[PDB]
Design a binder for this molecule. Structure first.
Ligand SMILES: Nc1ncnc2c1ncn2[C@@H]1O[C@H](COP(=O)(O)OP(=O)(O)OP(O)(O)=S)[C@@H](O)[C@H]1O
Ligand SMILES: Nc1ncnc2c1ncn2[C@@H]1O[C@H](COP(=O)(O)OP(=O)(O)OP(O)(O)=S)[C@@H](O)[C@H]1O
Ligand SMILES: [Ca+2]
Ligand SMILES: [Ca+2]
Lengths: 445, 288
């Protein structure tokens, strides 16, 4: 009974048989939408526009119409699928906008030489202005959501060393989708331009907001509370950043990816600054001494090219004899199931792989290309990457890693460039390119 | 008396380390929904853990009425896992599955033609298949074989990254001929009927290699004996070293399944988490 009156008011007409049946169950969320005060919202969006998008020339009247138009576009939509979409998106705003965007309105230069030395030895290969605005908004965001949003990459290092230049702000969140939907709407309302949210298959729990012209605006990686709780973090300027120690470890694993080394050669200077900043931090923070001395590091890595598995002899540094590193995640997943192992530690995009210790053998997957110095021989750059990949696990589990990290860095010193003979390809990751198209009332995953 | 202590319950058929000759002479409300809920929650959680659930389309064949599926759907939805559910059955599903943008309800009996149709439609979506197809007493061996032939057809056409298939080996004394099934782990099911020999074959596919293994009458003898031992001896025991409100084997088994499930609420101990999940599940299924 009351359901019909809810639906009729929402649709601004009398529900057809089919419509009352289809929307019947959403009666609750629909009422929340109708009851929501649309005036305070217009006020909120405007207030936001002045603090973060003053340079956007649009009428407060222009904003109002866009908004009120959206909260009534059900009254003009008859396709049930489109209706389900509008109700879903509207609810996200009604239930989360205030908490998410609403709240928003109230020693290095010494290590530079060491950095060059390390990087040069590895050098052996061969976007809308809305970002300026969004960037400044994220600066505040990181401060009001310390528990659900953490930063890494350039910006996080810039907070340590103001000399660092950053193009965007990299973040991990426990609520990416809600956040991205809220932000997409905010931009839509202020700007008037149709942004699209899309999900990328080969990235884990990844979503990005692109403008009307496919220009990158902002992206985010989703992680569960479990993961967020174990990620090594540091408190800086009222914001959490991924521990620079952990980021250093990921940088080392990153140089194993062919594309990244190619970036290193294009502009070596870019990496010197970030490298140096992290080296500095570690030396000061962990009392790590940088003498070209570090044994057993680059711990033997043997490739079995046919099965695409790199064996890493780890018995010198860890309890498990060796670590089998798979290059095909589906093969790893299937092999772990064969072992009847149900509790492999997962850290999602943070490590882009599960880690399992079974019968004192670690099983894991490596998401970057493996560089080779010769036929069937792993290039020392990838060996350090593999080693770094294992150390990420040590960090995520409060295990020992300090000495090994010291050994890893020291092994990067006084090195002669070794050319890249070849490299393995990454495994293909199937899946569709999903997206949310607000103006077209379409959600496809 | 008739209690026992174990380090863990038998999670897969291959673990059962004993047998008993079956004997022809061999309780909870909505226990069948609990059986499917636990097994699927377990299966999907494993896929979430290993990163294959992320952005997948879960194609469920023979899912009606599927009341329990509404629980799975909210669980993952609340964990922020993006999933597209496609529920297919010759019969209608429970109404609580209606009015959800992320779940498509299809009423129709599947055949080769239809399978090819949705594969074209879903492509390039990563597909996860769950089959609980039936066909009234106990199914004949001929019906079961027809069923396994169809499940194989589903796999070969849909090319899923992972699957959970209903698996109950024809009884020895009712053998027709040998047949094939995908390689995989045969997950035991807590809360299944008292003498059920049914299990869930879980597979994670490796590229274009559908691995097919033969099932023989000899394997049937083994399935019947292992399961009889498990149903007659093991499942009737109270686990003494299992510190839980209910020390029944089935609850012990359930605990090892639910302990692998993710929850964004934080608990002090695993026990506290499993307790919460169990209550949440029983509450949802209307089980006291
Ligand atoms: N923009 C809005 N539109 C409709 N209802 C709102 C709006 N903002 C708040 N409410 C209602 O007021 C209550 C919650 O107040 P809050 O959303 O937490 O604070 P707020 O007024 O939005 O503060 P702002 O973000 O400071 S800048 C609920 O009953 C909401 O339904
Ligand atoms: N392929 C990868 N493998 C392992 N770690 C990676 C990889 N790609 C990126 N990372 C990690 O994520 C961090 C940030 O990604 P980036 O895009 O390099 O951020 P950024 O360098 O600060 O941004 P700009 O545009 O270059 S200023 C890196 O410093 C690495 O620690
Ligand atoms: Ca960056
Ligand atoms: Ca970025």
């Amino acid at each position: 009974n009351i359901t019909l009156k809810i639906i009729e008011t929402y649709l601004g007409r009398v529900p057809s048989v089919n419509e009352y049946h289809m929307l019947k169950s959403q009666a609750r969320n629909i009422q929340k939408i109708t009851v929501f005060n649309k005036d305070i919202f217009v006020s909120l969006v405007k207030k936001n526009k002045k603090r973060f998008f003053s340079d956007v020339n649009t009428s407060a009247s222009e904003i109002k119409d866009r908004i009120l138009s959206y909260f009534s576009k059900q009254t003009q939509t008859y396709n049930i699928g489109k209706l389900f979409t509008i109700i879903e998106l509207q609810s996200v705003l009604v239930t989360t906008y205030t908490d998410i965007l609403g709240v928003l309105t109230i020693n290095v230069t010494s290590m530079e030489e060491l950095a060059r030395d390390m990087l040069n030895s590895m050098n052996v290969a061969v976007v809308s202005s809305l970002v300026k605005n969004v960037n400044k908004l994220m600066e505040e965001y990181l401060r009001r959501h310390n528990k659900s949003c953490i930063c890494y990459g350039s910006y996080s290092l810039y907070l340590i060393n103001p000399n660092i230049r950053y193009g965007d702000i990299d973040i991990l969140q426990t609520n990416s989708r809600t956040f991205l939907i809220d932000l997409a709407f905010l931009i839509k309302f202020i700007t008037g331009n149709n942004i699209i949210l899309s999900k990328i298959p080969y990235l884990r729990n990844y979503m990005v907001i692109k403008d009307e012209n496919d220009n990158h605006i902002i992206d985010s990686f989703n992680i569960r509370q479990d993961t967020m709780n174990v990620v090594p973090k540091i408190f800086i300027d009222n914001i959490y950043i991924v521990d620079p120690t952990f980021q250093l470890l990921n940088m080392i694993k990153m140089f194993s990816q062919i594309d990244r080394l190619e970036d290193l050669s294009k502009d070596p200077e870019k990496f010197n600054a970030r490298m140096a900043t992290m080296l500095e931090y570690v030396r000061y923070t962990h009392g790590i001494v940088f003498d070209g001395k570090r044994n057993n590091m680059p711990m033997k890595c043997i490739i079995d090219e046919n099965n695409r598995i790199v064996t890493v002899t780890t018995k010198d540094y860890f309890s498990f004899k060796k670590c089998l590193v798979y290059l095909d995640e589906n093969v790893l997943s299937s092999d772990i199931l064969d072992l009847n192992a149900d509790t492999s530690c997962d850290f999602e995009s943070v490590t882009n792989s599960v880690y399992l210790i079974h019968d004192n053998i670690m099983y894991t997957y490596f998401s970057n290309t493996i560089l080779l110095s010769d036929k069937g021989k792993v290039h020392e750059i990838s060996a350090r990457g593999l080693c770094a990949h294992i150390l990420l696990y040590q960090m995520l589990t409060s295990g020992e890693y300090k000495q090994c990290l010291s050994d890893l860095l020291n092994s990067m010193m006084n090195r002669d460039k070794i050319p890249i003979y070849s490299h393995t390809e990454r495994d293909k990751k199937p899946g569709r390119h999903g997206f949310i198209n607000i103006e077209k009332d379409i959600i496809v995953f | 008396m008739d209690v026992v202590s174990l380090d863990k319950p038998f999670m897969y058929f291959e673990e059962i380390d004993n047998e008993l000759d079956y004997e022809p002479e061999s309780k909870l409300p909505y226990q069948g929904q609990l059986k499917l809920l636990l097994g699927e929650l377990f299966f999907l959680s494993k896929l979430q853990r290993h990163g294959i659930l992320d952005g997948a389309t879960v194609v469920y064949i023979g899912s009606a009425p599927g009341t329990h599926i509404r629980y799975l759907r909210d669980h993952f939805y609340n964990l922020g896992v993006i999933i597209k559910w496609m529920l297919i059955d010759g019969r209608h599903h429970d109404p609580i599955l209606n009015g959800l943008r992320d779940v498509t309800l299809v009423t129709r009996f599947v055949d080769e033609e239809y399978l090819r149709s949705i594969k074209k439609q879903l492509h390039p979506s990563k597909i996860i298949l769950i089959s609980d197809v039936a066909s009234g007493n106990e199914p004949s061996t001929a019906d079961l074989l027809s069923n396994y032939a169809l499940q194989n057809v589903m796999i070969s056409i849909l090319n899923p990254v992972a699957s959970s298939l209903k698996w109950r080996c024809p009884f020895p004394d009712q053998w027709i001929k040998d047949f094939y099934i995908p390689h995989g782990n045969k997950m035991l099911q807590p809360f299944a009927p008292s003498y059920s020999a049914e299990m869930r074959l879980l597979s994670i596919y490796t590229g274009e290699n559908m691995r097919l293994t033969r099932v023989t009458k000899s394997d049937a003898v083994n399935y019947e004996k292992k399961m009889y031992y498990l149903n007659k001896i093991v499942r009737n025991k109270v686990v003494v070293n299992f510190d839980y409100p209910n020390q029944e084997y089935d609850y012990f088994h359930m605990y090892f399944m639910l302990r692998t499930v993710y929850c964004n609420k934080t608990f002090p101990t695993t026990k506290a988490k499993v307790l919460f999940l169990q209550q949440s599940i029983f509450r949802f299924l209307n089980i006291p």
